[PDB]
Amino acid sequence: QFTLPVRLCKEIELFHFDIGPFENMWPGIFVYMVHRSCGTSCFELEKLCRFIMSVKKNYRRVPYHNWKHAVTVAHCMYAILQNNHTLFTDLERKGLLIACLCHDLDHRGFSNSYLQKFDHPLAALYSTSTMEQHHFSQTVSILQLEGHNIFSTLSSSEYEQVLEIIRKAIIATDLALYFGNRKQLEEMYQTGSLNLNNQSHRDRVIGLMMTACDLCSVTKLWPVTKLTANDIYAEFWAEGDEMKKLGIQPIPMMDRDKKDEVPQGQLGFYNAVAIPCYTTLTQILPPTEPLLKACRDNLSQWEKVIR
Ligand SMILES: CC(C)(CO)n1c(=O)[nH]c2c3cccnc3n(-c3ccccc3)c(=O)c21
Ligand SMILES: [Mg+2]
Ligand SMILES: [Zn+2]
């Protein structure tokens, strides 16, 4: 039944768009993004709406890895897609927006390292990319619910094609995998061997897009960026608190007693992770340049905080 306001129509297209002040409209914002990416008949409205509300319900009340984070990541993907639409197939356009909304499904607010170290049942189930494999499992589980399968109308080979796009995209949100991925992609771009017709290459490009979307809070306007950083640190500190209880000293980043080091930690995160990510992405997809520009702007803001 929901209809989005006229001011948003043009603003939703921009990379720096902040979903933050529209909580009641987030399910409706996602529906709009889907119709603009693959048409009004791309998914049966009833199916799609059941799927979204179920996905929403399966995001816990954690400070950062919550419903808001899912819609934020999906919106960034929507902007990338819209600015490079002809470069992606209808099946990719569909799969990626769904993968972004589901990428942190049922996150408990603990890193893969925590679950591995403390031998959590989830780490026993999934050896590497612990949470990520759980997020893809949670996505399949939601699709398997009565009248949720938005992909039922696709052909047999086209169905396993989306589920494989989704699987690969969600796994690539494992930051530990990003570093190698970005390195292989930088090699291909420089040597001039990068070929989007090659499937293994497309998988890597998609992988980087997933990282770029996952970290997009660094591409918003400084007041939004700063407020998201508080949410991520509230989540890191809670994890550190748990480690302390179990007689383990957490790394500075997860220690609330080491709050003064946050600007220095951010500067390191932007120099080692965020800037290289958007630099490589801009080389492959030149219309994604505003993401790099906004990231550089926030990097200067963190330097100013240190100074
Ligand atoms: C991007 C964000 C949220 C900016 O506030 N951020 C930050 O400040 N430090 C970090 C950060 C620091 C260390 C490891 N991962 C981080 N990720 C992260 C977490 C899970 C999955 C993928 C990436 C962030 O998004 C982030
Ligand atoms: Mg994740
Ligand atoms: Zn995420």
UniProtKB/Swiss-Prot annotation:
Domain notes: The tandem GAF domains bind cAMP, and regulate enzyme activity. The binding of cAMP stimulates enzyme activity. Composed of a C-terminal catalytic domain containing two divalent metal sites and an N-terminal regulatory domain which contains one cyclic nucleotide-binding region.
Function: Plays a role in signal transduction by regulating the intracellular concentration of cyclic nucleotides. Can hydrolyze both cAMP and cGMP, but has higher affinity for cAMP and is more efficient with cAMP as substrate. May play a critical role in regulating cAMP and cGMP levels in the striatum, a region of the brain that contributes to the control of movement and cognition.
Gene name of the record: PDE10A
Binding site for 3',5'-cyclic GMP: 65, 266
Domain PDEase: 1-307
Organism: Homo sapiens
Taxonomic superkingdom: Eukaryota
Expressing tissues: Abundant in the putamen and caudate nucleus regions of brain and testis, moderately expressed in the thyroid gland, pituitary gland, thalamus and cerebellum.
Record: residues binding a divalent metal cation 2: 104
Name of the protein: cAMP and cAMP-inhibited cGMP 3',5'-cyclic phosphodiesterase 10A
Impact noted for substituting residue 104 to A: Loss of activity and of zinc binding
